[PDB]
């Protein structure tokens, strides 16, 4: 069986580290909910 435990508040932080690119990808979504690249 699964259970949940709190991890923190839902809040935006101004001292947040900024990372990650912004790629634009053509994908296809199947009936099971899995994404695939085209």
């Amino acid at each position: 069986d699964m259970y949940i435990e709190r991890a923190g508040d839902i809040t935006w932080e101004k001292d947040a580290e900024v990372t990650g690119n912004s790629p634009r990808l053509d994908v296809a979504l199947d009936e099971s909910g899995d994404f695939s690249l085209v």
């Binding site: 069986d1 949940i4 839902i10």
Partner: protein, 155 residues
């Protein structure tokens, strides 16, 4: 406890305590991704949370009520992924999301790589609104992970 905030989803069926995913509690409804829980019921200390709505293709599921998260990416501003990795603390990660281009429209996508136990962590806009969940995406040519910004429908 049904307090608003972000929660880890843990299981004991395997070795030790293992984090299968992450979820969001808002307005008494717990929002996570389908592949995290596979629609199973959840325990919150002494209480129990039963699924209310779910969709496998959307990779979303809600507990104890309807999907409440209705904010969306304005498209332009950068967002923050409140990643709750397994065995690690929640930390906000600011990023400018990309675009998943499908036949049924465009959806934002953040190019951030985290353990699979981070599935379901919320993605926020500048106002603190949950604009989507993290954990459903693809692996690109160099092999890093890019997750869609998966948001449900209120009402």
């Amino acid at each position: 406890e049904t307090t608003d905030g972000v929660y880890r989803v843990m299981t004991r069926r395997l070795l030790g305590s293992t984090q299968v995913g992450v979820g969001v509690m808002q307005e008494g409804v717990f929002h996570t991704m389908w592949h995290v829980t596979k629609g199973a019921a959840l325990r919150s200390g002494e209480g129990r949370l039963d699924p209310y709505w779910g969709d496998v293709k959307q990779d979303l599921v809600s507990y104890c009520g309807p999907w409440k998260l209705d904010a969306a990416w304005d498209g332009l501003s950068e967002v923050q992924l409140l990643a709750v990795p397994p065995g690690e603390r929640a930390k906000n990660i600011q990023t400018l999301p990309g675009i998943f281009k499908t036949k049924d429209g465009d959806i934002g996508a953040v190019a951030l790589d985290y353990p699979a136990g981070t599935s379901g962590s919320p993605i926020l806009d500048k106002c603190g609104r949950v604009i989507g969940l993290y954990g459903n995406g693809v692996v690109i040519k160099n092999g890093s992970y890019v997750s869609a910004i998966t948001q449900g429908k209120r009402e």
